[PDB]
Each structure stands twice: as structure tokens, then as C-alpha cells.
Amino acid sequence: DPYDPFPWYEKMRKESPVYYDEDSKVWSVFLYDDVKRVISDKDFFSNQFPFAKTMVSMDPPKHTRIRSIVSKAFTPRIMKEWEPRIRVLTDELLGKARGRDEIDLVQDFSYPLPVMVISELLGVPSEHKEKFKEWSDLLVSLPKSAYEEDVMEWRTIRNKGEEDLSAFFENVIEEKRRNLGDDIISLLIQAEEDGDRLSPDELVPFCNLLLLAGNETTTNLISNMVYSILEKPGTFDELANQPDLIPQAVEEAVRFRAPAPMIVRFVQQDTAIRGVNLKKGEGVIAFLASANRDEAAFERAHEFDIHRHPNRHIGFGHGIHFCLGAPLARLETKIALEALLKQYSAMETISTEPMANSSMYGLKHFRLHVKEA
Numbered sequence: 001d002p003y004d005p006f007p008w009y010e011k012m013r014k015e016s017p018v019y020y021d022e023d024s025k026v027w028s029v030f031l032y033d034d035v036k037r038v039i040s041d042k043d044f045f046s047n048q049f050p051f052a053k054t055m056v057s058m059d060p061p062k063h064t065r066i067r068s069i070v071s072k073a074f075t076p077r078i079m080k081e082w083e084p085r086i087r088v089l090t091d092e093l094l095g096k097a098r099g100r101d102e103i104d105l106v107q108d109f110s111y112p113l114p115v116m117v118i119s120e121l122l123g124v125p126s127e128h129k130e131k132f133k134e135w136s137d138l139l140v141s142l143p144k145s146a147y148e149e150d151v152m153e154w155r156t157i158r159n160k161g162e163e164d165l166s167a168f169f170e171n172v173i174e175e176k177r178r179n180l181g182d183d184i185i186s187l188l189i190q191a192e193e194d195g196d197r198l199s200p201d202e203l204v205p206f207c208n209l210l211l212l213a214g215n216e217t218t219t220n221l222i223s224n225m226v227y228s229i230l231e232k233p234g235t236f237d238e239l240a241n242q243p244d245l246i247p248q249a250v251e252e253a254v255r256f257r258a259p260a261p262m263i264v265r266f267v268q269q270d271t272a273i274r275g276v277n278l279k280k281g282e283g284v285i286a287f288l289a290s291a292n293r294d295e296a297a298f299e300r301a302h303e304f305d306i307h308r309h310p311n312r313h314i315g316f317g318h319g320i321h322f323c324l325g326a327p328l329a330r331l332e333t334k335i336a337l338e339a340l341l342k343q344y345s346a347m348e349t350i351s352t353e354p355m356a357n358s359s360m361y362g363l364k365h366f367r368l369h370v371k372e373a
């Protein structure tokens, strides 16, 4: 089963916490404390690997400047300003599924929602929604094979998709400068740090980064959360009788079934983890999914506990690169679960089809039997 790689994570935590793959010459780390240090110890583990124009591949001070500016678009105040809009979009998705006793949580809910949400939060007119989805699908696409002929064909089509989306965002930015609104692009136009503003050359890639970093991740979080709730008899009912536990259930879902299993860093200075020496220039794969299942870090790490509070997981990362969109992912996932708990008195898993992507843990299909309340 590709939806159950936890037994392997456990084998690697106890027999090879610090693993070196001779075929790829890249390190692997699986224990919570070591995964946490690799992703946060910036002085020794770097994000620069010579995505390229974005802060995800930057180290301080270049990262610090951009991070300090774009963070003004994800403040708690701004999130509350947008909570109503996310609820409307979620209600509209579920409304399209009224009068059915079987739905596919992915294709009918968890996959569409993030793309719809980020377009309305970015200020993209809703009248381009279907051409916005195509570009966003192209952005997160992967080649079917690793041979030159297949990657070359895929790269050329995503390149043209990224260029058209870039030109599309450049037009939205230009329009918002004259008619500013209540959206991310408008906020970043007027966002300023002692006179320092994001350039057009920086805003456009950043808006592509929001689609690339937020769409599938949030989709997988919602699907994995609903799956884990229905995996434990009584949790669905328990959440509907104590709705204030939903945020804690969202965090537990990021710990239990991390949508982004692994994070990459490059060794910046010679150092050692757990006694294993690592040379400058080597790649380290930090397995967040395994860190969040570490029994040395969490009590009953193999069980889904919606009462765990506070949750010290690192599914959103840790350090200066801590997920910029975590406030939005948390709010979106909370609202999605509330909308399901209110529309359905009961849900039952019929069949699941997991996503077999390396750098993503989620489901491509999640067919359910539902009962409207």
C-alpha cells in the first residue's frame, strides 16, 4: 500500500536514522530531532541549490527581505478579513453535490477548493476561473518518465504554461495599481518595508509560488484529514458534537498524514548529525512525515488524537522558511471540515486511490457514501 509508508519510516528511524543512498549520493534523515535541525539550522543547511526566482530557494539576507514583505499578506487580521469568502466558496462546492449519496471528496471538493480560494484571494477575476485552473494544473504537473525525450516534452509545455500565467498575473498587478482592492496582489502592491517594495519581477513569481505551494498541499491535507477522521470510529461524530476541536484536528492531520512528506536542504558547512559527518555540498532529504510519526517526540505517535494540544509537529516546517501560507491552509482546512460536518450527518469510506508521487502524500480518488442531514 503506497498510502501506508509509515512502517518503512519506523524501520528507518530505528535501523538507519541517518541514511546515505550510494546510488543518488544524497543523505536521508528520519528522526524528529534530526529532521527538525536540518530544516531550521540555516547556517549549516541551505535552501540555495544551483522556484529559482522565489524565496524557497533563497538564504538570508535575500530571503529575509522578501519574507518580511510578503508576510504582510498573511497576518491574522488579513486572514479574518478573508474567512467569509472561503466559506462562500466551500458552500458553493458542496451545494453542487446536493442530492447525491456518493461523492468523490477529491474531485468534488478537496481538489477544486484551494484553486478556487487562491484565485479569489489573489484578486483574479472569477471570470477566468477555468483558464486559471488549467495554468495551475500545468504548474503542479510532473513528467511521466525521467528520460530526456519525456522531460523535454513536459518542460516545454509547463514553460509555456508558466509564461502565460506570468503574463496573466502581470496584467492583474497592473490593473490593481489603478483600482486597488481587498486581495493579496493589492496588498503586496502597497506593502512596504521602510520604502522597500516588491518589484513586478518578484511579485509575479511569488504568485506562481502560492499556487505551486498551496494548491495540492491543501488538497492532500483536506483529503488526508477526512480519511483519518473516518479511519477512527466515532471521530466524525465527536467533531460534530465539539466543533471547537476542529483546529486541533487540523493540526493533528498535518502531524498524522503530512501532505508534504519531505523537504530538501543542502549542506552549507561541514558538520555532523548524530555522529554522521556530512560534507559541504551534499543534499539532505528531511522526512517531515517520519519526524511527525516519531515516538520519541509524540505520545502514541501511530494514533490519530484530536485532543493533542499544543501540537509540536513540523509538517509546516520550522525556522525562517516556516510555511508562509500555514494561516491560510489552517483556515481553509478548518472551514472545509465545518462545511462537511454541517452538510452530512454521516460519511463512510467506499474506496480510496492514493497519489503515488514521491514529494506528495495524498489521494487521487476518495469515493464516499454520504447522508445529508
Ligand code: HEM
Binding pocket: 039, 047, 055, 056, 057, 067, 118, 209, 210, 211, 213, 214, 215, 217, 218, 221, 254, 258, 259, 260, 263, 264, 314, 315, 316, 317, 318, 320, 321, 322, 323, 324, 325, 326, 328, 329
Ligand atoms: C497543508 C498545507 C501546506 C503544507 C503542509 C505546507 C508545507 C510547507 C513547508 C513544510 C514549507 C517549508 C519548505 C522549506 O522549508 O523548504 C512551506 C513553505 C511555503 N509554503 Fe506551505 N504548505 C501548505 C500550504 C500552503 C499554502 C496554502 C500556501 C500559500 C497560499 C503556502 C505557501 C508557502 C510558501 C510561500 C512557502 C515558502 C516559505 C519560505 O520560503 O519562506 N503553503 N510549506
